[PDB]
Amino acid sequence: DKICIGYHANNSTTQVDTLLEKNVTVTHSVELLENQKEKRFCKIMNKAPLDLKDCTIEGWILGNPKCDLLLGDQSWSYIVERPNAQNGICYPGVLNELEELKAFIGSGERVERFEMFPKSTWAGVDTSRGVTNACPSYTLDSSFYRNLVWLVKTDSATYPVIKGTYNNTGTQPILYFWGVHHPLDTTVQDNLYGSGDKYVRMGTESMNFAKSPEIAARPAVNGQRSRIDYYWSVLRPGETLNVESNGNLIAPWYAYKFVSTNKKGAVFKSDLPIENCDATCQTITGVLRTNKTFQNVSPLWIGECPKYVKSESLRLATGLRNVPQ
Amino acid sequence: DKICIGYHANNSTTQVDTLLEKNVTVTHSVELLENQKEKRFCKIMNKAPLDLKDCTIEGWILGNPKCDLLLGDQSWSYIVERPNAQNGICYPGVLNELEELKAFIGSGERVERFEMFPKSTWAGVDTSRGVTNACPSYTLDSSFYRNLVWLVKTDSATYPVIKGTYNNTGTQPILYFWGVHHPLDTTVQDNLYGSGDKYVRMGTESMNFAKSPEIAARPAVNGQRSRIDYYWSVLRPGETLNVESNGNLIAPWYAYKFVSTNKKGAVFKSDLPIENCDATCQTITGVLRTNKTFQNVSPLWIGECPKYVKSESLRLATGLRNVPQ
Amino acid sequence: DKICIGYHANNSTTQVDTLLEKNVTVTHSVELLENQKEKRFCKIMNKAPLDLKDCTIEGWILGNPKCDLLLGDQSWSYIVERPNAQNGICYPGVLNELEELKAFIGSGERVERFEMFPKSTWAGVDTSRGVTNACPSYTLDSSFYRNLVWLVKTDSATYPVIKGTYNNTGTQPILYFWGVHHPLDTTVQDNLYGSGDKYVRMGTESMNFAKSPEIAARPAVNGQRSRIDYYWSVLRPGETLNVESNGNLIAPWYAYKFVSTNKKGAVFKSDLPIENCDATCQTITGVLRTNKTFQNVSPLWIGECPKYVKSESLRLATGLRNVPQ
Amino acid sequence: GIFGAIAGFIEGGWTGMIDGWYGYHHENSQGSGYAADRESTQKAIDGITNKVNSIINKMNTQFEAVDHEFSNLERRIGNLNKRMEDGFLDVWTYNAELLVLLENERTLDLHDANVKNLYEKVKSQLRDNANDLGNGCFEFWHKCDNECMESVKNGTYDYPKY
Amino acid sequence: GIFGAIAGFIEGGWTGMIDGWYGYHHENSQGSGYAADRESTQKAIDGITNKVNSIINKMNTQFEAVDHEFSNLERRIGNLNKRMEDGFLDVWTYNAELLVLLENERTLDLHDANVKNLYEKVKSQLRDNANDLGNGCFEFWHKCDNECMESVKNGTYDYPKY
Amino acid sequence: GIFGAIAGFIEGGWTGMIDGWYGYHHENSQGSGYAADRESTQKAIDGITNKVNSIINKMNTQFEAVDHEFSNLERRIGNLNKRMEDGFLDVWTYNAELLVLLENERTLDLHDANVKNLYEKVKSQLRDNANDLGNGCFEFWHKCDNECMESVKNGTYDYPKY
């Protein structure tokens, strides 16, 4: 007659590591790390992402004519920019504070396009010949940014002082754009804006801007030796904007009422497919569907994701050392 | 006849958590985290903090006329700026590199105000009519910054080239300020500075400055459509400053000999009361009086504080499991 | 007849600390931290470091005449700048974006000097009198930067519009330099560049530059009340550079084909000796020769070093408590 | 294991005991069988469940990388952002991997301790009345029927009898 | 507890023993009383005091947040500063909370081990001369006066006598 | 130590045992000698070697400080870089120093456990046939020659004989 004391064994081959010993088979364990992704983009909070397709961020938001598919109001949970987008800044030039612009837009949720300065704002000048072959649309060989208007002298008269004003009476900040033209030589300058020292001056309650044309021949890009210095800013609720110029102004035409997100916001550069599905966790390299605590897929995500870690495995023993006989 | 082995029990109801078990009563324990504050500001190293009261940092250091209480020499262990301070930049404009200025001042301990350029420095111009209704004092309806002087043309003569020089012969760096006026139109420009292309140029051994007026009508602020671009810099010991201008100069009048702190320095934005007491640890939301190792009150402090942590409690068992009978 | 169970003791006096007990003698232990350095610089990947000797980074790369020892092609595993280097920017002025320049150069491995714009590039102007006593060589009392050329008017003629072009057809980016002269007054300006409003304009596919002379008397440095604003940039493979100027240009003469490193790169400010030896781990304060896991010598290094830590000792027990009898 | 029971003086486990982690094998005239000790098994499950959840809860924050962009004249702050992101990636990897190795070692030790104490509980009950075979088994000197067995398992074995 | 003594085979503690953590209860013709074992109590106090101070010393640095300000065109570095400050806040919270849970578990284990070893020290001294009741109590077979009691407590019990 | 063997009921170590960490001292008619127990010694060496290497491997990344420079108008980001570099310096110092204190305590405990279990292995083999002296020594009641000694050491002592 006998009684023995003992412990559980089973058919487990699953192993864990300890400080004293590697590769120890245990009866029960839990894996804490996820290494599996769905290689696609999905909706977050069942709001869809904004695919740029063949437009870059600059082309979309400046209103590049070949980005008409995107033109107007947009809502997004995040933005996907494709690595081989061809339609960006068509008329050569620098967009000032580009990296801060992308960060600002990334913090957003929704834009409403609206007409900020109708072409009939600018007295005594031409608003209908501001096109170029550097900026084709899909139908015209010479067009321009739908959110800007390239102002040129009329008939013969010297290009006069023009003025514009907009008091933001709404509750939402306004994202807007403008520019300063820099011709390649002094005859192109006179053909377009006449003679005299020209300026572009802008101002709000909290911001001043002043720039002059810098005439010089730059290397040809998209067939142009001239340049444009593009600019952006944000008009806060209650502020008002004054535009005063007597030459070289690429005027703000349309602009965006901007809704700031409370979540995180992201701008993913990726060629992954956007599909019709939902997710709570979206990394730049795919969706994660897990309960697990860690993941080694990506540090870059939107939504609620597991902690990122370089580990291949994080298996925790729960059961005991498996010693079957 | 018998002898038993056993362990201490007592009337403790204090509990701790372990990895295996929550809510375990123990005979002895120590709490390591502080969650208690005195909601007030005190002296640090029994040197008092500088209350700005109704002035912002810009108003205080530019010498806004309504900040005369603060005007002159100051010593501080840290600075308290009130959220509803009304007296800042009275004549509308941007203070350049504002955030770097606040950081510089925060690193300080003491300022000595002194006259850098007496009004009689600037030859052939008027130094007594540089006032404005945008900048009232408590007695005059039209005054100006006590540390600056708004220079205007005299009588009829064209505003000439003026010059100023200061060789810092002392042992302390000098914090100083200047400006460039930007009138709303071209008649106000001529009424004040005459005709011609104007400039403000400044230079030291290690710094150059050059700017021109940018004439345009900005939205009205404090009744002004004009603007001033304010500037600041630091003249190091042994350096000398040259001011050359022929228009639009808001001249440096008074300036500050600046003593850099060796401690940390802080600029607290808070409406908490400053009282007559001492402390070794001052957080933005109150004094901590402790021996404890952690605190969950604030990450922001001056003095010698406990490590900040989000925890509600960090109770360490010292005694054993309390099992009374 | 008896058998005893027991454990090893030895003559060890080496101690370790535990959470419960300090200063415990153990039979065996391993030290994990290194505190020993060779106070010298050695080769890394048996490529030697570049000693600047008596030149600063700016003097070396601008081609200060007193840095001819360094002039031309260089390869390095890292750069040693000496704290008391006297030969830097000889003709007073600011090198724009200096800190970004040092970071760029630190990321490099090799420079090839080559002639970018031969003096015969600039039509109708003098390229042989651009010297100064502020910039002596070791033989001439008045010379200039070997990588720049100070252009001055000829004979009598107004200084005309000059132009230069360089299409980078190679596979390596090009580091190049230029400048804009700022004379102390308006006669020196006319003596050198003639009358009229002058400009320096530069441009590539991705960069624009435009600046004008700002005439003013600055404090004397190296005998000069004038100044030069120095500039630098990088011409990427496939880009081309256009220089257009009608006054005040300090032209790019020589330039550097730049090889970017894949390793880390470092710029050590130190007066330590460079000797003929090899190393795998080089800190700013000396070589480390170890197998150990930690080191308390320096956070700053190139090569493959142990983790930096403030500890004096990190001794791990391997053996047991030493209890000899 | 440091307590010497699992893969120690009790050389192996029981695939035949399916209803728990620690327990008994009895043998008498009525026959043979395995039975879990539910008190010590449940206590172990509660403890380890609590350990797993505490780890899961302490690891319940995330460091958020961003891919803000940086121009070619922002090499210093772009590299600052990279070294900081890599910085937190390295300490959290260290924390997770080190915690798992440390907790695994102690978890196996806990089980080992529990088998040992269970064995001691039974040894302390039987005393004279059984022979300790040295492998976790006790041979009774008296007859132990099913209610005698059950009284050992529930810790109420009546020594003065038998 | 993994050593099986506290709230184990010694079911409860003694509110009557006030002068230490571990000790004895004796009973003989002269009567009854509690007495601390000072050697093992003091050794435990020194160990745990050392543990508390070491934790307090390793936690004796502070990460310093600053509220430097950032303009609207410095959104990237302003957010860099925020994520880094939150970064260190999260690892130090993790470190403190995890350390406390881990150290509490091991501290209770240490006490448990100490009661167990004290019990073993006495068992090893008495051997035949007393009956181990299984609950930490020993019934002597011989008379044990006050000096006999004290010789057990100070670990000099003389077995060959009695 | 929490297991009570090292500097405990086995008061001191043996300078005379040079070939291992744990072992035996025997004494019979043929004389006296020390001998390492190679199984438990080797197992301990493998375990601690594994612990040392795992620590060395988890600490095998480095935070890289840079001395990029910062102008006088970059006080905020220059200080951001300083606080971040000091930030990682402090958590890695904490991690290394705390890990070493914690691992040292547990390493000494492991050795203590191993001596204890070795002692138990022998006690369990001899049972009646020897007298446990309470200090790790066993006095045989029967003659134990060299092959009898060796059978205790290799764990095959034959109780039914003698």
Ligand SMILES: *[C@@H]1O[C@H](CO)[C@@H](O[C@@H]2O[C@H](CO)[C@@H](O[C@@H]3O[C@H](CO)[C@@H](O)[C@H](O)[C@@H]3O)[C@H](O)[C@H]2NC(C)=O)[C@H](O)[C@H]1NC(C)=O
């Ligand atoms: C631990 O196990 C023992 C043994 O299994 C349990 O004792 C058993 O208790 C039952 C009743 O609870 C006893 O049976 C009774 O017998 C009388 C007739 O004699 C009958 O009229 C009652 O209705 C009942 O059937 C049984 O004899 C007894 N076994 C013994 C003494 O060996 C004990 O209750 C268990 N304790 C715990 C806390 O689980």
Ligand SMILES: *[C@@H]1O[C@H](CO)[C@@H](O[C@@H]2O[C@H](CO)[C@@H](O[C@@H]3O[C@H](CO)[C@@H](O)[C@H](O)[C@@H]3O)[C@H](O)[C@H]2NC(C)=O)[C@H](O)[C@H]1NC(C)=O
């Ligand atoms: C451990 O406890 C025992 C028992 O309490 C201690 O032994 C006791 O020691 C005292 C003296 O130190 C003995 O008393 C002596 O007796 C003679 C007369 O016989 C007297 O003239 C001496 O002046 C003294 O009073 C006492 O008999 C003895 N108790 C015994 C043997 O049962 C022992 O010293 C303690 N050891 C330690 C290390 O604390």
Ligand SMILES: *[C@@H]1O[C@H](CO)[C@@H](O[C@@H]2O[C@H](CO)[C@@H](O[C@@H]3O[C@H](CO)[C@@H](O)[C@H](O)[C@@H]3O)[C@H](O)[C@H]2NC(C)=O)[C@H](O)[C@H]1NC(C)=O
């Ligand atoms: C553990 O130790 C014991 C004792 O040292 C080992 O048993 C010994 O084994 C040898 C052979 O392996 C026995 O010797 C044999 O005797 C016969 C004559 O009787 C001879 O012809 C054989 O060639 C051989 O010499 C020896 O008697 C025996 N010692 C005993 C029984 O006390 C045992 O093998 C060891 N086990 C392990 C796993 O190491």
Ligand SMILES: CC(=O)N[C@H]1[C@H]([C@H](O)[C@H](O)CO)O[C@@](OC[C@H]2O[C@@H](O)[C@H](O)[C@@H](O)[C@H]2O)(C(=O)O)C[C@@H]1O
């Ligand atoms: C509003 C306007 O002026 N549009 C013009 C445009 C501009 O005048 C010009 O971009 C300003 O610099 O010029 C257009 O063609 C210019 C033409 O120049 C040649 O040298 C070049 O080889 C061609 O590729 C082309 O750029 C233009 O297309 O922009 C005509 C347009 O009406």
Ligand SMILES: CC(=O)N[C@H]1[C@H]([C@H](O)[C@H](O)CO)O[C@@](OC[C@H]2O[C@@H](O)[C@H](O)[C@@H](O)[C@H]2O)(C(=O)O)C[C@@H]1O
């Ligand atoms: C030194 C000086 O010029 N002070 C003037 C001031 C300046 O000329 C003016 O600020 C420069 O732009 O003008 C003062 O009043 C101007 C007046 O303008 C009206 O259009 C407006 O409605 C009023 O609110 C007021 O700003 C002034 O107060 O600054 C007079 C002062 O003497």
Ligand SMILES: CC(=O)N[C@H]1[C@H]([C@H](O)[C@H](O)CO)O[C@@](OC[C@H]2O[C@@H](O)[C@H](O)[C@@H](O)[C@H]2O)(C(=O)O)C[C@@H]1O
């Ligand atoms: C190319 C050229 O002009 N070189 C001159 C130089 C420049 O004209 C001058 O630096 C431009 O501002 O002037 C040189 O000497 C100038 C002389 O000025 C005195 O006031 C001063 O006291 C002297 O130290 C010295 O600087 C020069 O050395 O640069 C002559 C040179 O040929």
Ligand SMILES: *[C@@H]1O[C@H](CO)[C@@H](O)[C@H](O)[C@H]1NC(C)=O
């Ligand atoms: C040991 O572990 C490694 C990975 O950790 C695994 O690839 C290998 O198969 C394991 N070996 C055994 C015998 O389990």
Ligand SMILES: *[C@@H]1O[C@H](CO)[C@@H](O)[C@H](O)[C@H]1NC(C)=O
């Ligand atoms: C428009 O702006 C002016 C500032 O010039 C402000 O005073 C006015 O109230 C605003 N009007 C509306 C309708 O908000």
Ligand SMILES: *[C@@H]1O[C@H](CO)[C@@H](O)[C@H](O)[C@H]1NC(C)=O
């Ligand atoms: C358990 O702990 C929580 C907080 O940790 C406390 O609020 C609760 O009262 C505790 N429960 C018991 C029974 O002690």
Ligand SMILES: *[C@@H]1O[C@H](CO)[C@@H](O)[C@H](O)[C@H]1NC(C)=O
């Ligand atoms: C003032 O500055 C000049 C530089 O122009 C310097 O040479 C001189 O020594 C200084 N004077 C004093 C008194 O420090």
Ligand SMILES: *[C@@H]1O[C@H](CO)[C@@H](O)[C@H](O)[C@H]1NC(C)=O
């Ligand atoms: C205790 O440790 C300190 C340093 O940790 C050492 O200086 C001192 O000599 C040690 N004391 C003893 C007695 O070993």
Ligand SMILES: *[C@@H]1O[C@H](CO)[C@@H](O)[C@H](O)[C@H]1NC(C)=O
């Ligand atoms: C030089 O640059 C031009 C751009 O103006 C480019 O089209 C041309 O192909 C380049 N030539 C060579 C040889 O690379």
